[PDB]
């Protein structure tokens, strides 16, 4: 298993990087999510303000 295993350890190094990179890219998605769901919270707060304006 000496000359099979080395190839296996080689593969784990590429997979190791890849797990990390996939989490580093997941993070980046989270940042966009913050800007998207916030863009939605402002125009739902607009109509909140328009609701108590048409009541006054």
């Amino acid at each position: 298993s000496q000359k099979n295993g080395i190839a296996t350890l080689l593969q784990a190094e590429k997979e190791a990087h890849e797990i990390v990179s996939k989490a580093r890219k997941y993070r980046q998605d989270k940042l966009k999510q913050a800007k998207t769901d916030a863009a939605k919270e402002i125009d739902s707060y607009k109509i909140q303000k328009d609701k108590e304006l048409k009541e006054f």
Binding site: Q2, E15, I19, V20, A23, K35, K49
Partner: protein, 52 residues
């Protein structure tokens, strides 16, 4: 040495390399929970001051 000894050494090693990346991966997205509240909170607040 022997094919058994190297095999054992093999299961422990690829386990450590892989586990360590998965645990680091958790740490990156633990930090992403913090940044999600923080940017969202800044961005919303800046605009809601202007809305008020």
């Amino acid at each position: 040495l022997t094919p058994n000894q190297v095999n054992d050494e093999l299961n422990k090693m690829q386990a450590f390399i892989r586990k360590e990346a998965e645990e680091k991966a958790k740490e990156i997205q633990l930090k992403a929970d913090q940044e999600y509240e923080i940017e969202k909170t800044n961005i919303v607040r800046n605009e809601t001051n202007n809305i008020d």
